[PDB]
Amino acid sequence: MSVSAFNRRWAAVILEALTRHGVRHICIAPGSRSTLLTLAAAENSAFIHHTHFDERGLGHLALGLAKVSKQPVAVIVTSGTAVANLYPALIEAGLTGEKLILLTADRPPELIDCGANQAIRQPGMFASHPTHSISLPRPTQDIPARWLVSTIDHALGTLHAGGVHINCPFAEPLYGMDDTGLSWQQRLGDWWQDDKPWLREAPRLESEKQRDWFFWRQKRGVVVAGRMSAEEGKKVALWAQTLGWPLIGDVLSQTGQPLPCADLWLGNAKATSELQQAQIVVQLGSSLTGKRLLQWQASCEPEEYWIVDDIEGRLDPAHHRGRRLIANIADWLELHPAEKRQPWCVEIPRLAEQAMQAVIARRDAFGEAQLAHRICDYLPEQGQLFVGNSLVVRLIDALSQLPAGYPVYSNRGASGIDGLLSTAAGVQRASGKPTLAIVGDLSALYDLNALALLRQVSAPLVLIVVNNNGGQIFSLLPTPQSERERFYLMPQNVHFEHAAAMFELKYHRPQNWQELETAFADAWRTPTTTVIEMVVNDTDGAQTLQQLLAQVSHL
Amino acid sequence: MSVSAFNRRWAAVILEALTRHGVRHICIAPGSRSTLLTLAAAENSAFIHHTHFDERGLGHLALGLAKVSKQPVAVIVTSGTAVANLYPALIEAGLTGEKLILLTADRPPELIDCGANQAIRQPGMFASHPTHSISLPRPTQDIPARWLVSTIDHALGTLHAGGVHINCPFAEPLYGEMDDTGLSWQQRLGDWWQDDKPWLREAPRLESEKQRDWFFWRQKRGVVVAGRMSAEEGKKVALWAQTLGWPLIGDVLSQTGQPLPCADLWLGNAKATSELQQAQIVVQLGSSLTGKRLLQWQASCEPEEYWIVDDIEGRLDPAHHRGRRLIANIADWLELHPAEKRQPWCVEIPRLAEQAMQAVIARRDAFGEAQLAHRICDYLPEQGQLFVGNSLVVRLIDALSQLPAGYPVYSNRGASGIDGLLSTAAGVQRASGKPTLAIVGDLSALYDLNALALLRQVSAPLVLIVVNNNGGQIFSLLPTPQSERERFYLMPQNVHFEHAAAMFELKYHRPQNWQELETAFADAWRTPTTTVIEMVVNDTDGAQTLQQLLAQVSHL
Ligand SMILES: Cc1ncc(C[n+]2csc(CCOP(=O)(O)OP(=O)(O)O)c2C)c(N)n1
Ligand SMILES: Cc1ncc(C[n+]2csc(CCOP(=O)(O)OP(=O)(O)O)c2C)c(N)n1
Ligand SMILES: [Mg+2]
Ligand SMILES: [Mg+2]
Ligand code: NA
Ligand code: NA
Ligand code: NA
């Protein structure tokens, strides 16, 4: 009889099911309609439980977790606007490959389209953004537990990447408990004390080994390093070296950047020339950062364009004739090995070295370009780097040479300035590692309430808020000068000292290299967050990037 | 010739079509793909432009501005997750009626599903929630200007309520010297440019016809329920119900003056529900009923007819009575359906109502949130407005307080999200330019904390009361499980707002008693600025006080 009882039983099946697909972290916001789920989640010791109050921030907390752990991560929110707040993180996951399990509680059908409080149309909400969507029915004994678990299983197990939306209607009552659904739960036999799914469906998606690799490696080819794992970046740096091919590695590639300041040199006739001679470009990973690289890539004309990543669909915004190959990068390289061939490029290496030389000559100024340049003086040892959006990711790319195999993380799929503080958190938590995060002032304002989560870290995390008073990328872009402060830049004339106090975070506003150094030396001493604020002249960053762009276009 | 110049006239037409549907305010966030729309929005002087860095907050600003002005309000965002951050406000629009028109910039088709940065599938992302959606094609001269403005005029002319999604693809280049490429293209509309009118006028009226059996129905023993409506409508509903001598069950969102206050306590006494059992008809004006006992009574009553009269569409009766659903401007309907003077039929309820109120008054003294809820009418700004937050505050004020007639009350009680409250309030004050009282709980203030930025520009004093019971104490009102309540429900954040207030240069007070609270109330009404007032309370005293009071009154 007890509708309470059953409800908690139906939710219990749901949350154990995900025990079977590697779900370790579950992130939770409060709600009422959510109780069946949250309880079930709370009572299951297979999980590490996180909570936050801002469902959008929650979503990015899961995102961060998933991004580092490479595990599916489950989220529970209540019905209503709460669910919609998950959209951003979902969109990004749908683009970058994070597996997010979204369990969104709902009113029963009796209560849809009839003026009931907090009652929205929720199935289909995220349209084509989730990889799989599940519209669960009105919980009843008449549908066996085996159906419920078989559906969840198919969803999770055939999940190459992106998230999964599972909608979970619950009618009232929701608080009560009885035996009511016990015999129904036990129809699942010893599955309850098992390790595995009820239904095992986990076929692999992989592109066959390319039979003409041996032909193609003998030609003048270029390697492009996209977003990939720390370790894939090492394996790739080595692979290109051996092949003799010039490596143009993005900031997110953790390849070592053997030809640094690419955003610069790629802007020089002598470089484009040499590169014109290539016949095959093999790009590994995607979401390329630099402006000049995207243009080079747009207009480059090799006989064939290869792109290799374990994410599905097209990744060439330019639509070259060629191939799109789905694989684990490290797995793909083993399968397409390199043979010792001799470097064919001779003028690019000069140009790279000269372009870095141009940059260090400009290093003394206490600005954001200078910070980005000098960033690997600051990387916490055995740690990880979370890079913001806007100017920051573009600066470090253009100006800094990151070590091979140092892990970098970032939200570069859709590039939102909306989840960054909270993504950084879930990144810090997933790996246990000291973390450095850099973000601009509008991005830290966006997600300012994530300063709450940053009270619970498992190793030091330093948040650098580069404060140039507004969205200054819109001073790098040729935005109509007259409208640009009010409708582009939006300076908020703010600081972050009180924001840090509120969440009892340690704060520094260093005013030169000496004091920012002391800041760090205090930061890494304790398993807490410290807000560091660099206040800089609004356009110094972008101007300087521009001048170096011209400098390097000229030699 | 120049692509970037055609893009500008393509946008300029779009923003000029808005101009002829009453669109006055337009809320804008930064962006680059949005640039043509933002240029055309800012070049076009028919608008008042509002800007904000947070697109969910921007969304909620637009919502507020619309909530007050009753005009459609425009938003401009760039492509990506910026678009997705408008969902909250859109869905709330979907329920309470605000016309928000969302101009969402986009990459052109080529750059979709190809690994392009900041490029997501934008058409349809909001599903059924917007009222209509336009999926505008790739800008070209081969599509007559007269097409773009007809399609918008249809969109806006036929919008009875809720949101509009206009997706705007634009292809690089987006910057250049403004040639005069699409000019003769623009000139194809002709003097329309100098008119004030829609190109196509399509604005057919949706309304329910006159209830020809009203003279019969108005003579029976009815009940009048008053939900969300306009302040003016409140007054009107209060007269009309006292005329028919029916008992008025007014919601806090009803603005009737609640002649039977504390309905949430007296509806729990077995004597009231017994009397009401006599009702042959219930005429409910407006929707989103507030308290639990009125919801429980609504679901349980069994008149021969139930009527919901409101100017939004669809069913509004979550209990699905036999009866009628009646779409119209409430006042208009009062005029079409006049009251006849008849004898009050209710003997018991009016006695309990004054007995409920007395019982609350007995407890007015303690410095907690139940008390604040009760006293509030003593603190309303002269000729100003009330923005009432979600969770406890709405329910306590509903339960424990009696607000005056026709005092404007605003809130987000459609989906009841605590995700956009401050940012909504700002928009709510900007729309009318009235002194404003927004009350909001601690998690609700963390959720929109960056909206503090927006509450640095107010035309008129606005007080922000933050009630800090260290958590979501509505989860102490509900029978949640004692074991996991604290970390999985209440989520106490252990925080204050002194510094948040300092951060945005907003005056702060943490009053400890009634003397201090009213002091802070006074100096606050003397400047067109926000003064934040944080009331720190013992977490469960609010919940309990209500609980107890529900119990005392169920025994009277
Ligand atoms: C959700 C969302 N809103 C808006 C944008 C557009 N956008 C890109 S960069 C940027 C500027 C961010 O400013 P700041 O945080 O200071 O970084 P800075 O530009 O100074 O480098 C904006 C608003 C976006 N990418 N995502
Ligand atoms: C966007 C959104 N997320 C979650 C909820 C569910 N919810 C309702 S009340 C509440 C707690 C609000 O806490 P607080 O702001 O401190 O007010 P109080 O409960 O103390 O009245 C939550 C999380 C909601 N209605 N909307
Ligand atoms: Mg900035
Ligand atoms: Mg609270
Ligand atoms: Na896993
Ligand atoms: Na299998
Ligand atoms: Na004070």
Side-chain angles (χ1 to χ4, degrees), chain B residues 88-112:
Chain B
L90 167 56
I91 295 144
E92 174 65 22
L95 293 174
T96 69
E98 286 79 11
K99 320 171 169 232
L100 300 192
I101 319 277
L102 322 161
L103 319 184
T104 68
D106 201 327
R107 323 298 228 209
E110 323 82 82
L111 290 185
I112 305 318

Short mmCIF file of all heavy atoms in Angstrom, two decimals, chain B residues 88-112:
data_model
loop_
_atom_site.label_atom_id
_atom_site.label_comp_id
_atom_site.label_asym_id
_atom_site.label_seq_id
_atom_site.Cartn_x
_atom_site.Cartn_y
_atom_site.Cartn_z
N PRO B 88 15.96 29.49 -17.15
CA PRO B 88 15.20 29.72 -15.93
C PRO B 88 14.14 30.79 -16.07
O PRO B 88 12.95 30.52 -15.86
CB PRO B 88 16.29 30.14 -14.93
CG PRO B 88 17.40 29.32 -15.30
CD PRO B 88 17.37 29.23 -16.83
N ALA B 89 14.56 31.99 -16.42
CA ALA B 89 13.63 33.08 -16.63
C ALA B 89 12.60 32.77 -17.74
O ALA B 89 11.43 33.10 -17.59
CB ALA B 89 14.39 34.36 -16.92
N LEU B 90 13.00 32.11 -18.82
CA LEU B 90 12.06 31.75 -19.87
C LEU B 90 10.97 30.85 -19.31
O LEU B 90 9.76 31.09 -19.57
CB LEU B 90 12.74 31.04 -21.05
CG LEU B 90 11.85 30.34 -22.08
CD1 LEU B 90 10.82 31.27 -22.69
CD2 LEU B 90 12.68 29.78 -23.20
N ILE B 91 11.36 29.81 -18.58
CA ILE B 91 10.33 28.88 -18.13
C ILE B 91 9.38 29.56 -17.13
O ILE B 91 8.16 29.35 -17.19
CB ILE B 91 10.91 27.60 -17.55
CG1 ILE B 91 11.65 26.82 -18.62
CG2 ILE B 91 9.81 26.74 -17.01
CD1 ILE B 91 12.87 26.14 -18.10
N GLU B 92 9.92 30.38 -16.25
CA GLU B 92 9.09 31.18 -15.36
C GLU B 92 8.14 32.09 -16.15
O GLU B 92 7.01 32.37 -15.74
CB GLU B 92 9.97 32.00 -14.40
CG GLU B 92 9.23 32.96 -13.53
CD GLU B 92 8.34 32.23 -12.59
OE1 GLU B 92 8.68 31.04 -12.39
OE2 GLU B 92 7.32 32.81 -12.06
N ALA B 93 8.62 32.56 -17.29
CA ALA B 93 7.81 33.38 -18.20
C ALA B 93 6.72 32.49 -18.72
O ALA B 93 5.59 32.88 -18.73
CB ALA B 93 8.64 33.91 -19.34
N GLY B 94 7.09 31.28 -19.10
CA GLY B 94 6.15 30.30 -19.65
C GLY B 94 4.95 30.07 -18.77
O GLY B 94 3.87 29.75 -19.25
N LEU B 95 5.13 30.28 -17.47
CA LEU B 95 4.03 30.04 -16.54
C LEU B 95 3.20 31.27 -16.11
O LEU B 95 1.97 31.15 -15.99
CB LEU B 95 4.51 29.25 -15.31
CG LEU B 95 4.95 27.80 -15.55
CD1 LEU B 95 5.52 27.27 -14.26
CD2 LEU B 95 3.81 26.90 -16.07
N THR B 96 3.84 32.41 -15.87
CA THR B 96 3.13 33.58 -15.29
C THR B 96 2.72 34.65 -16.35
O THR B 96 1.87 35.53 -16.08
CB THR B 96 3.88 34.21 -14.04
OG1 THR B 96 5.10 34.83 -14.46
CG2 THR B 96 4.24 33.13 -13.03
N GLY B 97 3.32 34.58 -17.54
CA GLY B 97 2.79 35.32 -18.68
C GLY B 97 3.68 36.37 -19.28
O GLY B 97 3.39 36.87 -20.35
N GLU B 98 4.73 36.74 -18.57
CA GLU B 98 5.66 37.73 -19.04
C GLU B 98 5.99 37.46 -20.48
O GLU B 98 6.26 36.33 -20.85
CB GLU B 98 6.96 37.67 -18.21
CG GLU B 98 6.87 38.24 -16.78
CD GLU B 98 6.20 37.28 -15.77
OE1 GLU B 98 6.00 36.09 -16.13
OE2 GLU B 98 5.87 37.71 -14.63
N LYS B 99 5.96 38.49 -21.32
CA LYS B 99 6.45 38.34 -22.69
C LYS B 99 7.93 38.70 -22.67
O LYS B 99 8.30 39.87 -22.47
CB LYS B 99 5.69 39.22 -23.69
CG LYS B 99 4.20 39.29 -23.44
CD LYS B 99 3.55 40.32 -24.31
CE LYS B 99 2.03 40.21 -24.23
NZ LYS B 99 1.46 40.11 -25.63
N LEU B 100 8.79 37.71 -22.84
CA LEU B 100 10.20 38.07 -22.96
C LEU B 100 10.52 37.64 -24.33
O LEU B 100 10.13 36.55 -24.74
CB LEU B 100 11.07 37.34 -21.93
CG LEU B 100 10.79 37.56 -20.45
CD1 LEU B 100 11.92 37.01 -19.60
CD2 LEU B 100 10.66 38.99 -20.22
N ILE B 101 11.22 38.50 -25.06
CA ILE B 101 11.60 38.14 -26.41
C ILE B 101 13.10 37.99 -26.43
O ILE B 101 13.84 38.97 -26.21
CB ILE B 101 11.15 39.19 -27.43
CG1 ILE B 101 9.73 39.68 -27.10
CG2 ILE B 101 11.26 38.66 -28.85
CD1 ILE B 101 8.64 38.81 -27.60
N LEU B 102 13.53 36.75 -26.66
CA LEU B 102 14.93 36.35 -26.65
C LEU B 102 15.57 36.33 -28.05
O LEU B 102 15.27 35.46 -28.88
CB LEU B 102 15.06 35.00 -25.95
CG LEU B 102 14.14 34.78 -24.73
CD1 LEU B 102 14.02 33.31 -24.42
CD2 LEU B 102 14.53 35.59 -23.45
N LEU B 103 16.43 37.32 -28.30
CA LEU B 103 17.31 37.39 -29.48
C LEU B 103 18.64 36.74 -29.12
O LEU B 103 19.49 37.32 -28.43
CB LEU B 103 17.58 38.83 -29.95
CG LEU B 103 16.51 39.92 -30.00
CD1 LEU B 103 17.08 41.20 -30.60
CD2 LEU B 103 15.35 39.41 -30.82
N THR B 104 18.79 35.51 -29.61
CA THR B 104 19.91 34.67 -29.32
C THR B 104 20.79 34.49 -30.60
O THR B 104 20.41 33.79 -31.55
CB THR B 104 19.39 33.32 -28.72
OG1 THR B 104 18.66 32.55 -29.70
CG2 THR B 104 18.46 33.60 -27.51
N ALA B 105 21.94 35.14 -30.60
CA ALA B 105 22.89 35.14 -31.69
C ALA B 105 23.42 33.74 -31.92
O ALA B 105 23.35 32.92 -30.99
CB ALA B 105 24.05 36.11 -31.38
N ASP B 106 23.94 33.45 -33.11
CA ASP B 106 24.30 32.07 -33.45
C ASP B 106 25.30 32.03 -34.56
O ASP B 106 25.40 32.96 -35.35
CB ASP B 106 23.04 31.31 -33.92
CG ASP B 106 23.17 29.79 -33.82
OD1 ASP B 106 24.28 29.23 -33.99
OD2 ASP B 106 22.14 29.12 -33.61
N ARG B 107 26.07 30.94 -34.64
CA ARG B 107 26.93 30.74 -35.79
C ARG B 107 26.09 30.33 -37.02
O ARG B 107 24.95 29.89 -36.88
CB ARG B 107 28.05 29.74 -35.51
CG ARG B 107 28.65 29.77 -34.12
CD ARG B 107 29.32 31.07 -33.76
NE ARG B 107 30.66 30.89 -33.16
CZ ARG B 107 31.23 31.73 -32.29
NH1 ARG B 107 30.60 32.79 -31.82
NH2 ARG B 107 32.45 31.50 -31.84
N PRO B 108 26.64 30.52 -38.22
CA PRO B 108 25.88 30.14 -39.37
C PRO B 108 25.93 28.62 -39.48
O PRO B 108 26.82 28.03 -38.88
CB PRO B 108 26.63 30.82 -40.52
CG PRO B 108 28.02 30.93 -40.05
CD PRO B 108 27.95 31.11 -38.57
N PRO B 109 24.97 28.00 -40.23
CA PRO B 109 24.84 26.53 -40.42
C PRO B 109 26.17 25.81 -40.59
O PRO B 109 26.39 24.85 -39.88
CB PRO B 109 24.01 26.39 -41.72
CG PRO B 109 23.75 27.75 -42.20
CD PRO B 109 23.99 28.71 -41.05
N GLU B 110 27.03 26.27 -41.51
CA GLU B 110 28.35 25.64 -41.77
C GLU B 110 29.15 25.27 -40.50
O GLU B 110 29.84 24.23 -40.47
CB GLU B 110 29.30 26.56 -42.57
CG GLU B 110 28.75 27.42 -43.62
CD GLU B 110 28.18 28.69 -43.07
OE1 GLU B 110 28.93 29.68 -42.80
OE2 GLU B 110 26.93 28.68 -42.93
N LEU B 111 29.08 26.15 -39.50
CA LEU B 111 29.87 26.03 -38.28
C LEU B 111 29.12 25.28 -37.18
O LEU B 111 29.49 25.36 -36.01
CB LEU B 111 30.27 27.43 -37.79
CG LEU B 111 31.30 28.23 -38.60
CD1 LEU B 111 31.62 29.50 -37.87
CD2 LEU B 111 32.58 27.43 -38.82
N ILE B 112 28.07 24.55 -37.55
CA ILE B 112 27.34 23.73 -36.60
C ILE B 112 27.70 22.26 -36.72
O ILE B 112 27.71 21.71 -37.81
CB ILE B 112 25.81 23.98 -36.67
CG1 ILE B 112 25.51 25.47 -36.47
CG2 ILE B 112 25.05 23.13 -35.62
CD1 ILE B 112 26.34 26.11 -35.38
#
